[PDB]
């Protein structure tokens, strides 16, 4: 390709600012965009620039070029959850109708919580008998802690979630794991993963 | 706005698909992109105005046809497994600066699949706050699954009292798969609800997890004596619980 970004892929904290990298070989070169992709969506333009501008910003999002290098960078200030996403470099060879785009591969961005508080726990939770299953919930768990997908196809395990609370300024982390199966208890459904040494076990 | 249907699709193998786009800002340049899940846009064919038609860097088993300004229809031809990804129409107006902005529509997210007896709606079910949970945090934690389902083609939401919310709300980014070492395996979902623990202890409260099911439609062939798979709504609900 000739729009290359760096880095693959990086995860940070909320609070956090990141910086994400495009390097170029488009030649002629008019302009360059930064896109962010959302899951499930189409791009939306954050920022375009032209071959003598530096720097473009839209709200928290910065963006800085050096035509002459072939460089641009994406810096997010003060990243928050909605950050997280798939952010496209996208160079144009020419200023008008006729030039064409080219696409960098995009760098996923995920956005965990800061959890200063964490307070670890597996809970069983109940109704249903609506489905033969039994389902667990790993929770309350800082963003360190790595949530591992199971290799039983009787116990499934999703990877971690970050719910927010708006009205209480609360975010919590989760995992959920179940199995139909009997042999299935919430003790030891998350075995292969590393909980913390303190997790509560009702 | 931009636009674009359907959104979802399923389809057989072999079978002749078209694409639906339309453009109401008067733009010229339009564009058609494919792009599989977690990868790159590749652009596959683009128009200048009314009768322009090119294609991109990318051949494919598709053609595309500008007859008016507003329409920009994608067809696929022989359905094979391959076009499963996301199909993502665009235009492009002069936005000001002398520069042009390139707008994107909403997308269809396509499966294509061997036989459509592989197709199921999903299960939901909705699981109620632990008790240990509810005096260690006072809060409480809903969980609503969603399994068997194929294709991937599902919309999950949280309605308390009649009203949708966000607050407090994660569904998994990504679904499961049933049985991975399948080509057509099904999947399940998960969603978590948290609300304070006075809340849920309000037998007042009403909580449903919805599943919007996109599958074949009523005009689609079905010889498989099975409940037809259609789009449809599978929803689970729970009680607050005063204890």
């Known amino acids: 390709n000739q729009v290359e970004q760096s880095p693959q892929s990086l995860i940070i904290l909320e609070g956090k600012n990141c910086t994400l990298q495009?390097?170029?070989?488009?030649?002629?070169?008019?302009?360059l965009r930064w896109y962010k992709q959302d899951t499930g969506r189409g791009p939306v333009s954050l920022t375009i620039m032209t071959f003598s501008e530096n720097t473009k910003s839209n709200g928290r999002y910065t963006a800085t070029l050096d035509a002459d290098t072939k460089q641009s960078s994406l810096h997010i200030t003060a990243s928050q959850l909605s950050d997280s996403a798939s952010y496209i470099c996208?160079?144009?060879?020419?200023?008008?109708?006729?030039?064409?785009?080219?696409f960098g591969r995009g760098t996923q961005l995920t956005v965990w919580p800061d959890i200063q508080n964490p307070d670890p726990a597996v809970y069983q939770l109940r109704d249903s008998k609506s489905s033969d299953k039994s389902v667990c919930l790993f929770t309350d768990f800082d963003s360190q802690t790595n949530v591992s997908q199971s290799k039983d196809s009787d116990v499934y395990i999703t990877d971690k979630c970050v719910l927010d609370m708006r009205s209480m300024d609360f975010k919590s982390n989760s995992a959920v794991a179940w199995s139909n199966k009997s042999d299935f208890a919430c003790a030891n459904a998350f075995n292969n993963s590393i909980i913390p040494e303190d997790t509560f076990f009702p | 706005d931009i636009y674009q249907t359907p959104r979802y699709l399923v389809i057989g193998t072999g079978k002749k698909i078209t694409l639906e786009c339309s453009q109401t800002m008067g733009h010229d340049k339009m564009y058609w992109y494919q792009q599989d899940p977690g990868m790159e846009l590749h652009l596959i064919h683009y128009s200048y105005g009314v009768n322009s038609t090119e294609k991109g860097d990318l051949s494919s088993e598709s053609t595309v046809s500008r007859i008016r300004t507003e329409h920009f229809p994608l067809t696929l031809e022989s359905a094979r497994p391959s076009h499963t990804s996301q199909y993502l129409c665009?235009?492009?107006?002069?936005?000001?600066?002398?520069?042009?902005?390139?707008?994107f529509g909403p997308g269809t997210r396509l499966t294509v699949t061997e036989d459509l007896k592989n197709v199921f709606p999903p299960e939901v079910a909705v699981f109620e706050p632990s008790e240990a949970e509810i005096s260690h945090t006072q809060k409480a934690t809903l969980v609503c699954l969603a399994t068997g389902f194929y294709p991937d083609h599902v919309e999950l939401s949280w309605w308390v009292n009649g009203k949708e919310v966000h607050s407090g709300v994660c569904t998994d980014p990504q679904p499961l798969k049933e049985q991975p070492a399948l080509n057509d395996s099904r999947y399940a979902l998960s969603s978590r609800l948290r609300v304070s623990a006075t809340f849920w202890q309000n037998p007042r409260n009403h909580f449903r997890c919805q599943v919007q099911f996109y599958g074949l439609s009523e005009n689609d062939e079905w010889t498989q004596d099975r409940a037809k798979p259609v789009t449809q709504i599978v929803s689970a609900e729970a009680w607050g619980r005063a204890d």
């Open positions: 665009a235009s492009s107006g002069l936005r000001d600066r002398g520069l042009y902005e390139q707008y």
């Open positions: 996208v160079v144009s060879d020419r200023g008008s109708t006729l030039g064409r785009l080219y």
């Open positions: 495009c390097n170029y070989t488009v030649s002629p070169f008019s302009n």
